[PDB]
Amino acid sequence: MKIVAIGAIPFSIPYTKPLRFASGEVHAAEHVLVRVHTDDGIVGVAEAPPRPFTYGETQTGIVAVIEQYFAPALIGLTLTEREVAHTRMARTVGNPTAKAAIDMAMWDALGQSLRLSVSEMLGGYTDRMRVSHMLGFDDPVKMVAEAERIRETYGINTFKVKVGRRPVQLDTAVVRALRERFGDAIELYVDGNRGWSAAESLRAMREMADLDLLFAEELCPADDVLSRRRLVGQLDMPFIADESVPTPADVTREVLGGSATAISIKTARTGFTGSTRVHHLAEGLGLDMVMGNQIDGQIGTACTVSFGTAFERTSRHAGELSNFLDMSDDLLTVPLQISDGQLHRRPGPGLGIEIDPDKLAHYRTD
């Protein structure tokens, strides 16, 4: 189980409909397929989604850091030297998805080598997660229509509404329309992607005080430090930190500083080894955690569910596992299936997925 090579292949798949939010937009999945090859002939895979408006990574940059720094530093290690790989990669600052992809591909290879799913190796608490869908910006009537379509089609009963627009009433009207249309039959929460000021955020949440929102996520910039802390202290529900807590150290600083009262865990940025560190830190501190979506393709979603199903604290909440549906196509030989508002972790070893050679050949851009 020795790593003989690590590759980074850029690919691009158009979105049927772009996902828009306060911090940016995604019109295509311009990701990087990361592959870890072992001396046993096994190939572990994962993807790295470049999100310049979240981490500052670019597709070109991810391929570069992997080919120029990480691959050379990890070749020669075995799949059971994860902490050596973790420590070596840590010598390089940032580059979250590049690091996470390598870690997850290593876990995929390990699982295949041992005939065990990543989920069970991590803890195997359960076999499925409830699904939460992120509703991107769009005309009010269109967002409600999208929610209705998704709920009826896939049985999804949890929605995270993208907000952070002006005037604030535009978003509060959308959330109210959703609650009036579905009643208490659905769970609702919001994500502002740093779009509102702390003051606007409070006014918005106060207006929606009767809508039973479960969480408030990154309503204002965490970097508006003092006003952010004041806002978090004013809200009843937990305030989920996401882009502001990419590492365990950030979790500690933001939580102890009062700028976060809940934590988003995204395998796209902390993989499995790093995500376990976040889960354990959050559980130890006593904070709620939710599996988030990095506007993942099916490869990344398979990773999210692999980790989320491994622990009780992550599976007690719905996981954001459905935005891949807006992609026009994907790279798996067998597409992920969401039914009854749930997504099961794959039954196969590792991530339980396989890359379709024809799809990769068609969408790769190298």
Place this chain on the structure above:
Amino acid sequence: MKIVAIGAIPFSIPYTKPLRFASGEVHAAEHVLVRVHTDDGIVGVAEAPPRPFTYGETQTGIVAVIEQYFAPALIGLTLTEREVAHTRMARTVGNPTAKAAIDMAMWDALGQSLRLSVSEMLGGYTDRMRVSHMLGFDDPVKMVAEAERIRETYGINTFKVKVGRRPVQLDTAVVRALRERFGDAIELYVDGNRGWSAAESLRAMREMADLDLLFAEELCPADDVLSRRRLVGQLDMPFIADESVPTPADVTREVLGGSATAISIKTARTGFTGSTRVHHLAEGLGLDMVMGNQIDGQIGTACTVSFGTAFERTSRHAGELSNFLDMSDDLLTVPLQISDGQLHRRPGPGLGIEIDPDKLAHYRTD
């Protein structure tokens, strides 16, 4: 890899020389051998040391909780459902070594089933740890003689001196004698096992200010809450919490409250699943951690080194891995070997140990 049975066998092995400390004494290893049997014919093992003066467990009590509560609740689970086992056992409060032993025996069985060492499955950072020996109470001249014997015989260069006696000068004289006898060729730190008051502790440490002590461990009771916090804030070096932080929640309360500035990790009380939770919490908070000794037999020591070698943060410090030497005999077919002041993790799958049938038959007390 399904668990078909879990047994708890009490055994007793006399100590060649008793280990004495502020909170109690150990004259024999009256432990419990815990065995996890799988449907593959594999048997994972671990031990549970009853320490009434530390956790309140008794040999009889450990066997009882395992046979009456834990075994019935875990039979039927697979070795890859560790989080289910963790959650089910958590329904019962306390009983740390009983829980830890089951967890470690499960990991041992898993390793054997996969032909992988526990160390590598946990992270595989390194293959060995430097060794630290705990020097129990005894005449000043005799403690120095013991240190000299151990250093020359095994190459051990780190010693944790047991203190907490009155007058305080008795212990400070011992530590000074050790530093004068060995110079800077050895690492030294102290453990008071709650024996001194916070005021006595400060006076003692001030008297030893020129002895370059690396850590101060549980000098006074953590339950002398406010004076404990004042003391911790007065000391230069990290103050290791041990018996006061048996769970991650305790780590959080004691660290945020200021009663601890370093954390002892003992596999005897948190096993491997729980110990990973402690390591990740401590690393995330940014605190030093040291692998401690629960006055372990060789079975427990094999567990300590399995975990300690898996991570960088634990292996950067010497691990307390040598007090089993004072036992008159043990249960392994192949005894642990300490050379050049180091202990390597076992090369075999799981814990890399095997119970000698003849030894178990002779020392069991059921």
